[PDB]
Design a protein around this ligand. Sequence first.
Ligand SMILES: Nc1ncnc2c1ncn2[C@H]1O[C@H](CSCC[C@H](N)C(=O)O)[C@@H](O)[C@H]1O
Ligand SMILES: Nc1ncnc2c1ncn2[C@H]1O[C@H](CSCC[C@H](N)C(=O)O)[C@@H](O)[C@H]1O
Lengths: 276, 276
Amino acid sequence: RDLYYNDDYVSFLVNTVWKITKPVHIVDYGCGYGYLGLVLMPLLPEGSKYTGIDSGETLLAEARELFRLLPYDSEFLEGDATEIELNDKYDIAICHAFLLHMTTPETMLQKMIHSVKKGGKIICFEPHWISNMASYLLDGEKQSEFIQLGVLQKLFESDTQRNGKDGNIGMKIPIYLSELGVKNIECRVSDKVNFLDSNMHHNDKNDLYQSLKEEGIAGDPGDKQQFVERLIARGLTYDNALAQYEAELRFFKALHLHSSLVYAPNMKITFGEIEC
Amino acid sequence: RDLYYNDDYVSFLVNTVWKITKPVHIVDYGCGYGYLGLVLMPLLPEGSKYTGIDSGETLLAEARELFRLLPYDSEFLEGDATEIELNDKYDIAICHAFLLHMTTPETMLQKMIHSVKKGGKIICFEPHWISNMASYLLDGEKQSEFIQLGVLQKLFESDTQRNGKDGNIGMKIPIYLSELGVKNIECRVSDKVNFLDSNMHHNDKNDLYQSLKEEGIAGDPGDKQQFVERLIARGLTYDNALAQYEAELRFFKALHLHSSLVYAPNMKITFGEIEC
Ligand SMILES: Nc1ncnc2c1ncn2[C@H]1O[C@H](CSCC[C@H](N)C(=O)O)[C@@H](O)[C@H]1O
Ligand SMILES: Nc1ncnc2c1ncn2[C@H]1O[C@H](CSCC[C@H](N)C(=O)O)[C@@H](O)[C@H]1O
């Protein structure tokens, strides 16, 4: 949450850009444990309703227990978002890091749109891995030493061509929304930038490091052979998978609590309106 | 201007993030024709003073004529920003796409800081070419086809190692500011995303295309031989310079008025405070 979005910036989107003043009925697809709800409900007009959809039974159990303690009206539906049939029309349909797992993104977006009432809105929070990866700066190390953008670029394109899952879908949402007839389409990059400051000595700096590691940043690549073979099987040559391995190994050994790291997740927020 | 920043987002930074309520005395280094002033003065408290510094005589002539028609108190000083000696202390020292042209960024930043009064602020608007380049999506084309991130990554790192000019300095400002003792350092990514919509048929869509081209997006690479030799001389191999050429040629031929393009300049806005 606090690693991808600034609290003040999300409030900016809600109150200034989207100008939401009246309570809204929102549906969140692939809500997980209700992340997007924990982010937006506090900023939405009092009286707003939050409905999350997810197939993970355990996830919904955590979500329910989590929102049980909150003063927000929230409900969670268990079911396959690609087949679930809703009976109501919502003011806003949203999702966070959901569409990138869909083999047929456009279709799922189509379904989300159909669940929105005329004059309603659709907001998608999706990542753009390639811009995310290019948004790294490690003091004392050349980016190309621990991040092979060229290899990553080919790798993410290959995976998408295979199963269909698009890790860079965040920048394509505007186009999918356009083809689907959505109006007033606009995309925005979360303004969030994380800065692990080597000269900041405070508990907050230590907490940021913990969050970074819990997110898997600069994780151990593991067994070299399994790694190279795993990548080669995804559409990469041997010299590419190797360069990638040595790159990840370098990052694993270079990053530590005392380091200076600047990172902008580059999350993509696309929204548009449903033709009245 | 409108290609790199959203009007509402800049106002957000001024009023909500920086919370500037009292009129401020700001100095802009390498102001060019006064771009940053045309952007911030309208949003700053009435009574604010704008002072720009630049070595380009013609540039300052245009700036003066441009601000002559405006209701903002503005003055332009002609001189080398790396040697100019100011007699006053400013509330805020700023710059836009200036530090990337400095061979010794840290030193110039040091000078900017010295021109700021205790309790004052320093705001730097600098680019991050690599994240800018990775932030491209062209419908109907694979990013790796018209943009070689791997080559660009090596290329920009090489240039920096040579003359010292850093095209990716935007993400390093926080670190330079940290070493210089600046407090409350925070970086933000402009939330701007340009979307040339193939399904939008309106004069605004045509204007966006014009702006994109005037900025040099997808420009003709020119003579193949001169191009490859030019890059090789900058620290790249032959197979890299060639891949780069064919990449730029593809973009030049693929992008047109009817295309769907999504682009997030990824400008980096770093700011901090001078200890008082
Ligand atoms: N057909 C489907 N229906 C519902 N959920 C699905 C799905 N296919 C994949 N998912 C899932 O989609 C979610 C996306 S990952 C987590 C998303 C959540 N909004 C967050 O940002 O934390 C997972 O929790 C997982 O259960
Ligand atoms: N030592 C120096 N003193 C003043 N200007 C300098 C300089 N070294 C380079 N420059 C310049 O720095 C500027 C940076 S490019 C333009 C910056 C302007 N803020 C804009 O965004 O439009 C140029 O106008 C050029 O004149």
